[PDB]
Structure formats: structure tokens, C-alpha cells
Amino acid sequence: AADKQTLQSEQPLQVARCTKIINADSEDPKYIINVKQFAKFVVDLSDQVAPTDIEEGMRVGVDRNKYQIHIPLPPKIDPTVTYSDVGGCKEQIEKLREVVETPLLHPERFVNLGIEPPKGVLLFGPPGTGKTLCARAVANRTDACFIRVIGSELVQKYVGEGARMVRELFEMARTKKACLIFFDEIDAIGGARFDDGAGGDNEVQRTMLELINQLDGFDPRGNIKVLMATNRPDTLDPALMRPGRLDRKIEFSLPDLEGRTHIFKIHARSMSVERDIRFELLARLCPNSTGAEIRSVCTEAGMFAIRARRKIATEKDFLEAVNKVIKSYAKFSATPRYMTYN
Amino acid sequence: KQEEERSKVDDLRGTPMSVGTLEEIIDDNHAIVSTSVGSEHYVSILSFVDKDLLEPGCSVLLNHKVHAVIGVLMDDTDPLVTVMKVEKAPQETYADIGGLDNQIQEIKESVELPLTHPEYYEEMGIKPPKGVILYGPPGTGKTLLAKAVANQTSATFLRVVGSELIQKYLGDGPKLVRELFRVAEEHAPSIVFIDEIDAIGTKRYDSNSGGEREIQRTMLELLNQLDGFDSRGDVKVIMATNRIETLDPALIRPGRIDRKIEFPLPDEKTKKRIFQIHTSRMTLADDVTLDDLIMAKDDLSGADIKAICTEAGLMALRERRMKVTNEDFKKSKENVLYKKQEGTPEGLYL
Amino acid sequence: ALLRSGRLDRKIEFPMPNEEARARIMQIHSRKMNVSPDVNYEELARCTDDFNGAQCKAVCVEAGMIALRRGATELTHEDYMEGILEVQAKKKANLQYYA
Ligand SMILES: Nc1ncnc2c1ncn2[C@@H]1O[C@H](COP(=O)(O)OP(=O)(O)OP(O)(O)=S)[C@@H](O)[C@H]1O
Numbered sequence: 001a002a003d004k005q006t007l008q009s010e011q012p013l014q015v016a017r018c019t020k021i022i023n024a025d026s027e028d029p030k031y032i033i034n035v036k037q038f039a040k041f042v043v044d045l046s047d048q049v050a051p052t053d054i055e056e057g058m059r060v061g062v063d064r065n066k067y068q069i070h071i072p073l074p075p076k077i078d079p080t081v082t083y084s085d086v087g088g089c090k091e092q093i094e095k096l097r098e099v100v101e102t103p104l105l106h107p108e109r110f111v112n113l114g115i116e117p118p119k120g121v122l123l124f125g126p127p128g129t130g131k132t133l134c135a136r137a138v139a140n141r142t143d144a145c146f147i148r149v150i151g152s153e154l155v156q157k158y159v160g161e162g163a164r165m166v167r168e169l170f171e172m173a174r175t176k177k178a179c180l181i182f183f184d185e186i187d188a189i190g191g192a193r194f195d196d197g198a199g200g201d202n203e204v205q206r207t208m209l210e211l212i213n214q215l216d217g218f219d220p221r222g223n224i225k226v227l228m229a230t231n232r233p234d235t236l237d238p239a240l241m242r243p244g245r246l247d248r249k250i251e252f253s254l255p256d257l258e259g260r261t262h263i264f265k266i267h268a269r270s271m272s273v274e275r276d277i278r279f280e281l282l283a284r285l286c287p288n289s290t291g292a293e294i295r296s297v298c299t300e301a302g303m304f305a306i307r308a309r310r311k312i313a314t315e316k317d318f319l320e321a322v323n324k325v326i327k328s329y330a331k332f333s334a335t336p337r338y339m340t341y342n
Numbered sequence: 343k344q345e346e347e348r349s350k351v352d353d354l355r356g357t358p359m360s361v362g363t364l365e366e367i368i369d370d371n372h373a374i375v376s377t378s379v380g381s382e383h384y385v386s387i388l389s390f391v392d393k394d395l396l397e398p399g400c401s402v403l404l405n406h407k408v409h410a411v412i413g414v415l416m417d418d419t420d421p422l423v424t425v426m427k428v429e430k431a432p433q434e435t436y437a438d439i440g441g442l443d444n445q446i447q448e449i450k451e452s453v454e455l456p457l458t459h460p461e462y463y464e465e466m467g468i469k470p471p472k473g474v475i476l477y478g479p480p481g482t483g484k485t486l487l488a489k490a491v492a493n494q495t496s497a498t499f500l501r502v503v504g505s506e507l508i509q510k511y512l513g514d515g516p517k518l519v520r521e522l523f524r525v526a527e528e529h530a531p532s533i534v535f536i537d538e539i540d541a542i543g544t545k546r547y548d549s550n551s552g553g554e555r556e557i558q559r560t561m562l563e564l565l566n567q568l569d570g571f572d573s574r575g576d577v578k579v580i581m582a583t584n585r586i587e588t589l590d591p592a593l594i595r596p597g598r599i600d601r602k603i604e605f606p607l608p609d610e611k612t613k614k615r616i617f618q619i620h621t622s623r624m625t626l627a628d629d630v631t632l633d634d635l636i637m638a639k640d641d642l643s644g645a646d647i648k649a650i651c652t653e654a655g656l657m658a659l660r661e662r663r664m665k666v667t668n669e670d671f672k673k674s675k676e677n678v679l680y681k682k683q684e685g686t687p688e689g690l691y692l
Numbered sequence: 693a694l695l696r697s698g699r700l701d702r703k704i705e706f707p708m709p710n711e712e713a714r715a716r717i718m719q720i721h722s723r724k725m726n727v728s729p730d731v732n733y734e735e736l737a738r739c740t741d742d743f744n745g746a747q748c749k750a751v752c753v754e755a756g757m758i759a760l761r762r763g764a765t766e767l768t769h770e771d772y773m774e775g776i777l778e779v780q781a782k783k784k785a786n787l788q789y790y791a
């Protein structure tokens with residue numbers, strides 16, 4: 001009973017049903033609310049509130065008897081959002097150097113020649129290829145800053161909540177200088193305006209409009225660069241294909257052979273192997289593979305290096321690792337077992 | 343005395359009391375309560391109960407008329423925790439070596455040896471396997487090997503059936519995921535086992551809400567809880583199925599589940615031992631040759647061998663005969679398999 | 693049925709940009725950029741054979757970008773030509789058996 005008497009004084013002070021906001025009229029507050037389950041409503045406010053902060057994508061206090069608007073806050077928040085080896089793909093970091101580094105170093109080549117600074121890139125390539133590494137490998141030279149954002153993190157079940165996190169990311173971006181948010185799975189974020197008379201997946205729609213608004217147009221970017229990752233330039237918008245926003249389209253695909261030797265260097269140096277072995281034979285054994293699968297190969301040679309007590313990996317450890325992954329774990333073991341060839 | 347303070351707390355309460363699911367801290371002790379159906383006034387809390395026992399968004403004791411928070415919820419003994427929290431380390435590690443021997447070694451040096459000696463990753467900078475899907479044909483040993491690692495252990499084993507998470511209430515299953523991973527968090531280094539999550543994908547019910555919009559949310563809570571944040575560290579979780587078609591690949595991808603392990607239906611060289619050991623504890627007229635049964639069924643599981651080696655003795659002891667005739671093995675196997683059709687084709691290699 | 697004569701009244705085909713239309717739109721993209729007056733648009737557009745307006749834009753922005761490589765002060769005629777010698781977007785070849 002540490003506060004029991006005051007609890008017998010709050011019984012005449014009780015208000016404010018949850019009631020998320022759909023939208024409003026114009027010229028006036030005149031908002032529109034669904035409660036949860038019943039119906040819809042075209043509401044108006046109580047007088048002692050701020051009609052400013054009753055904006056769309058919010059859940060306000062609402063009276064029982066008059067449904068008049070009381071004080072909001074964001075009642076849906078915080079759990080909502082989950083480089084020495086610079087040199088992976090080759091022709092890519094140089095175009096990365098261009099579109100990122102050259103506006104962030106000099107407005108000398110750009111404004112004087114009469115062009116606008118290229119500010120955004122459409123990365124495209126298969127997954128497991130190092131979009132994350134090149135993205136973060138930008139952040140050695142800027143200052144140190146990076147944030148990572150998967151697209152389907154914004155799949156949360158309230159209207160404009162993803163747009164609210166667009167608000168959050170763009171008002172964290174301008175707090176800091178020379179920073180890097182990263183984008184990925186930008187198809188579910190939306191590039192195509194699919195519509196018929198259904199009214200469904202619309203938080204994506206208004207969040208994507210919020211994305212076009214805060215991205216480019218109405219106080220542009222400055223010392224903020226954001227890469228967008230995909231397998232397709234096919235499911236995007238012609239409003240960010242507005243030709244001065246995302247105009248480079250850096251290309252890469254599976255590495256050649258020597259790229260895989262470089263990734264062999266990378267995931268050989270960062271673990272316990274022996275420094276007397278080669279990798280080009282293993283590079284021949286990987287005609288189509290990813291550096292993520294090179295990580296799997298190196299961790300599997302580490303699994304053999306667990307099997308026997310090995311901290312100095314032989315060539316045979318990586319031999320049986322590749323033999324494990326590409327021929328004895330590609331599906332089972334028995335695509336070989338015939339000569340006809342040798 | 344204490345009696346009057348307790349009576350005044352009891353009369354802060356109004357005897358029809360209720361229960362509602364929350365979302366979020368409202369730090370200055372006034373709160374707001376969804377119900378099941380979610381009608382949410384700016385409520386208080388009866389300030390002698392501990393508000394800070396609990397993390398955000400969980401059931402408490404409420405009122406019906408002013409909706410205010412009253413007490414902490416009871417640690418509600420759902421039928422899961424008695425099954426989820428594995429009571430004893432039961433039995434059956436290996437009564438009989440010679441059933442698999444391929445992925446016994448694999449499950450050993452992938453589940454025991456990283457966990458029970460977590461000092462090899464010190465030398466070689468390797469991450470442990472978090473999830474491994476053990477799968478294959480039905481009746482192989484997946485549940486058996488799960489119990490085998492469940493007894494042969496030093497970690498607090500946990501055992502979960504995939505239909506334990508399927509209840510008709512709203513948000514019930516996600517709460518069961520929450521308490522499930524509380525159980526998975528708050529024992530020890532632990533070996534969670536999950537079974538039958540291929541019986542969850544093309545599955546709809548009548549004791550149910552909107553079907554594709556019910557366990558999408560539950561398995562999405564599983565997604566956001568299992569290998570999301572809330573740092574992984576050392577928590578062993580094993581999931582097992584028979585088929586792989588109904589699996590969302592969002593959970594099959596790395597980060598969440600590393601190793602993919604099938605199980606072959608065994609060769610005849612180990613069928614002789616499995617048929618022998620399933621027949622090891624009965625009386626049998628030893629003239630009969632199991633090599634007929636061993637060579638015959640081309641894709642036998644061990645439940646096949648189980649039902650054969652027991653049902654032949656059942657057909658013999660049906661008429662009270664201790665030892666089994668070979669045509670009782672005929673009757674047994676032709677009961678066990680519906681239309682024992684492995685002869686030509688083929689049959690006529692030959 | 694999608695055209696007939698009340699669905700869409702007119703059937704308006706579009707000409708491939710003959711010569712001067714390529715030069716015109718290529719200059720339209722080079723309107724706001726620094727262009728030194730040593731540019732002959734008829735030469736540029738006339739040595740562009742089979743270029744649509746997509747490639748008009750591609751060539752003028754590649755003339756920007758190729759001149760943006762070396763840190764030149766403005767565009768250059770050979771950079772226009774290497775926008776064009778961005779292979780007329782015709783690739784690759786391996787080539788193998790064509791000797
Ligand atoms: N070209 C490369 N050079 C160096 N390392 C590479 C390369 N490609 C892949 N890798 C390695 O393999 C990993 C690939 O996994 P991540 O980049 O982390 O995830 P990801 O799948 O590449 O991200 P996405 O799908 O491309 S957005 C990298 O982190 C490196 O460890």
C-alpha cells in the first residue's frame with residue numbers, strides 16, 4: 001500500500017482509448033479513426049490538445065463518450081527495427097569510389113562542369129557476392145559510420161509505422177556526418193504501384209512515397225550515402241529512376257578465378273591454417289561458387305581441423321573441404337563414380 | 343499492522359478482475375492495457391505490486407470497470423512447460439551401435455564437441471552451428487537420435503513437438519514462443535529439440551482463426567525470436583522433419599540454420615543387424631532366413647523392421663506359438679506394407 | 693479489339709532518330725553541362741548508326757562520365773566518341789569458331 005491512497009484518487013481521472021489514426025480532412029483537424037475491430041469514424045478533437053501532432057500513422061487518446069482526441073505519443077515504438085581487404089570485385093570499388101567519394105571530396109569536377117553530383121547507386125548482383133563488404137568498405141574513409149537495414153524489418157502491422165521508421169532513419173541521418181545506411185530487399189519496400197480495387201498492402205505504398213520524399217527532393221542529402229541492393233532493376237519506380245538520383249548501376253556477378261583466390265587469401269588469413277599451402281587448385285575446384293561458400297569451405301576445412309587436432313591446415317584439409325561441399329554436400333555424394341573421362 | 347495495508351490493497355482491487363496483453367513501457371507508472379479484444383484506457387498500476395518483474399508486453403491482472411493494472415500474472419502452467427522442460431535424462435543413447443554410424447559421428451562432433459568443449463573455436467576462430475535440420479524418410483531414427491543426445495548429454499535438454507504451438511486463441515502461440523524461449527534461455531547451456539515442423543506448413547484447422555494469418559504470425563515470432571537478436575551465444579537448438587517442401591526458405595538460409603543433414607535408409611549390411619536386434623529379445627525357430635526380408639523391401643525404414651519383427655511374433659503368439667514360422671513372416675510383412683510390390687520390377691536384371 | 697477505331701483512334705509510329713534528331717537530343721542532354729565549342733554534332737550523331745533515344749541519353753551521359761574520369765575541365769570530343777565507342781552497347785563476343 002505504498003501509494004494506495006492516491007490510487008483511491010485516480011478513480012475520477014481516467015480517459016484515452018487507443019484508436020489508431022487513418023487520415024484527416026483538409027482546412028481543419030477533422031481526423032479519421034478506426035478503433036480496433038468495430039468500424040471506422042471521422043473524428044474531431046478535444047480542445048486542450050495540439051492539432052499539429054495528430055498526424056497520420058499514430059494512435060491518439062480518445063474519450064469513451066465523445067471519442068474526442070486526447071494526447072498521443074508514439075504508442076508503437078522501439079522493437080520495430082532489427083577494412084583491410086578493400087578489394088573484392090575490382091571494377092566496382094572504383095565506380096563506388098566515383099559515386100561516393102567524388103561528391104564527398106570535391107564539388108570541383110561536378111558543379112564547374114555543369115553536372116549534378118551522383119548521389120545514389122543501384123547495386124545488382126547475386127546474393128553472397130559481397131554487397132555487404134563493399135557497402136561497409138566505403139566506411140573506412142568517410143569517418144567510421146555505418147548502419148545496416150534489411151527491407152523486411154519494416155514489415156510491421158500498423159499504418160505508416162514503416163513510414164515512421166523512415167522518419168527515424170532520415171532524422172538520424174542528419175544528426176551525423178558522412179554516414180551510411182544500407183538498403184536491401186527493396187522489392188517488398190516497393191517499386192511498382194500495383195493496384196486494383198482491394199486496399200491491401202498500402203503501408204508499403206505510403207512508406208515508399210515517404211521514401212521518395214525524404215530521399216531526394218526537399219532538402220537533399222549532403223554527407224549521407226545509402227546503397228540499395230537487389231537482383232533486379234526491374235521492379236523499381238521511375239520516380240527514383242528520375243535520372244539524377246540512382247544513375248550508376250554498378251555491375252558484378254560471380255567472381256572470375258582470381259577473385260576466388262583473393263577470397264581464399266581473406267578467409268585463410270583470418271583463421272588457423274598453415275602458411276605453406278596453395279589455393280589455385282581449390283580455385284579450379286570452384287567453377288561456380290560464392291565467397292560466402294568460400295567461408296563455408298574454410299569453416300569446413302576448420303571442421304576437418306577439429307576432427308583431427310589441426311591448427312595448421314594442410315592442403316588436404318581444404319581438399320576434403322571442397323570435396324565435402326561441392327561434390328559430397330552439393331546434394332549427397334553420387335554425381336561422380338564413373339571414369340569415361342580420365 | 344500489515345493486515346490493514348493488505349486489506350486496503352485487496353480493496354483497491356474490485357473482485358471481478360481481468361487479464362490483458364500489453365505492448366510497451368509507459369515509464370511513469372500510468373499504463374494502457376489491451377485486452378484480448380484491446381480496449382485501452384490510460385490505466386494505472388496498483389503500486390505495491392512489482393511492475394519491474396516483467397519485460398515489456400506481457401499479461402498482468404486487470405480490472406473490468408476502470409481497467410487498471412492490479413497484480414502480476416500467475417506463472418501460468420500451460421501444458422507445454424511440463425513437456426518442454428525435459429524432466430529426466432531419460433534412456434536410449436545407444437543400446438545397439440550399427441544403425442547409422444555416419445551422422446552419429448557428425449551429430450557428435452557438431453553438437454557435443456563444440457558445446458561440451460567450447461575451447462576449439464579459441465584456436466581456429468570458427469562459429470558454432472546454431473541450427474541443424476536432421477531429416478529424411480519417416481521411421482529412420484531422428485526422434486531416436488534426438489533422445490540419444492538427450493540422455494548422452496551434459497546440457498539441459500529440451501524437447502518440443504511442432505503441434506504444441508497450435509492453439510485457437512489470439513496471440514496464444516506467440517506467447518508460447520515467448521515462454522518457450524524463456525525456457526530455452528533460463529536453464530543452462532541447453533539442447534533444444536524441435537520436431538514436426540513440416541506438419542505446420544500446408545496445415546489449416548477448424549479450432550482456428552484466419553488460417554494463413556495465424557501461424558504466419560506464430561512462425562514469424564519464431565523467426566524474430568530464434569535466430570534474430572537476443573544474442574545467440576551457446577544455445578543448442580535442433581529441428582527435425584521428414585519432408586522439406588512446406589519449409590519457408592527464410593528459415594532455411596544461413597545465419598539461422600547452418601548444416602543440412604539427411605539420413606539414408608540403410609544398406610543390407612546394417613539391415614542384418616537391425617533385423618537381428620529387433621529380433622534379439624524373442625523366441626524364434628532359427629531355421630528361417632531373414633535375408634529374404636532383408637533383401638526384399640528396397641526402401642525400408644526401421645519402423646518397417648520394428649513392425650515386421652514384432653508382428654511376426656504377434657502372428658505366431660496369436661495362436662500361442664513361441665517360435666515363428668516363415669509364412670508368419672509372410673503374413674507380417676504383407677500386413678505391414680500395403681501391396682509389397684518390389685518384385686519384377688525387378689526381379690529381372692537378373 | 694484493343695485498337696479498332698474508337699479504342700485508340702490513331703496509329704502513330706515513331707521514326708528512329710534519323711541523324712539530326714540524335715544530335716538534337718544529344719545536345720539537349722548537353723545543355724546544362726560545360727561544353728567546349730569544339731563539338732560537331734552532325735559528326736557525332738552521324739557516326740552513331742542504329743542509336744535510339746535511350747542510347748542518345750546513354751552516349752551523352754557516358755561523354756559526361758568518361759570526361760569525369762580524368763578530371764578534365766569540360767567535355768571533350770574524343771569522350772563523346774568513346775561514349776559512342778562504349779561499344780554501341782553490342783556485346784561481347786567470346787568469340788570461338790568464327791576464326
Ligand atoms: N567478392 C568478394 N570478395 C571478398 N569476400 C567476399 C566476396 N564475395 C563474398 N565474400 C565473402 O562472403 C560473404 C558474403 O556474405 P555477406 O556479404 O555477408 O552476405 P551477402 O549475401 O553477400 O549480402 P547480399 O545478399 O549480397 S545484400 C562476405 O561477407 C565475405 O566474407
Ligand SMILES: Nc1ncnc2c1ncn2[C@@H]1O[C@H](COP(=O)(O)OP(=O)(O)OP(O)(O)=S)[C@@H](O)[C@H]1O
Pocket residue numbers: 435436437438439440441442479480481482483484485486583584616643644645646647648
Ligand atoms: N540404437 C539405435 N540405433 C539405430 N537405430 C535405432 C536404434 N534404436 C532404434 N532405432 C531405429 O530408429 C527408429 C526410430 O524411429 P523414429 O525416427 O522415431 O520414427 P518416426 O518417429 O516416425 O520419425 P518421424 O516420422 O520423423 S516422427 C526405429 O524405428 C528403429 O528401427
